[PDB]
Amino acid sequence: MSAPNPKAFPLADAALTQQILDVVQQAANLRQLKKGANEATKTLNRGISEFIIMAADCEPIEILLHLPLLCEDKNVPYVFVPSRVALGRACGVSRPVIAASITTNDASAIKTQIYAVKDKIETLLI
Template identity: 70%
Template sequence: MATDEVNPKAYPLADHVFTTTILEIMQQCANSKQLKKGANEATKTLNRGIAEFIVMAADAEPLEILLHLPLLCEDKNVPYVFVRSKQALGRACGVSRPVIAASVIANEGSQLKTQITNIQTSIEKLLV
């Protein structure tokens, strides 16, 4: 698959600018321990009701390993978005490995609350 082609199942896909914004927020969330990395951890945060939003990598192989997450997100009413690169997602999560999914988790009294809310709103606009 060519690098500029993205699996059509990876919807909604953030554009370049929005991806940068998301990854910057995720970096800050990683620093303040408000981030869970990996599809399994993301699933757990959804089931526990502590996920603020979910970010998934559109280049996960096979993409099907992630596709239970959008369904779960819709059940739990949690916004979700795809970014193009698992490598970039991994870097934003503060690890050197690729990360195919990550969950930003709720934290009362967090300084990032407004930024997280802005991302949630932007993701919801993508879904319309």
């Protein structure tokens, strides 16, 4: 690694990242996912989001640091995962992606993976 960014918080570990990124991609294929900052910021304003994933090592980090303060008002969990390049892949994109918002459909197929991971994430926010 490199010095993990002090502002990065909650930071998911190795074992949670595998469980999270796997859900991301699993949602990508049902197109319940939304990738990128602005696409994610849109979600919260509307009110459809489930949780946000962000890149920890996003350079500079200040460009996404607004999401946390928005999430806390809409009561939406969030975490950082350790690299952007990995998050890029899971969304089905060649290229680096710093944020992503899974959305809501309560008829969904993957519904029970999501509640699983939010339950894990909200633990990190102590």
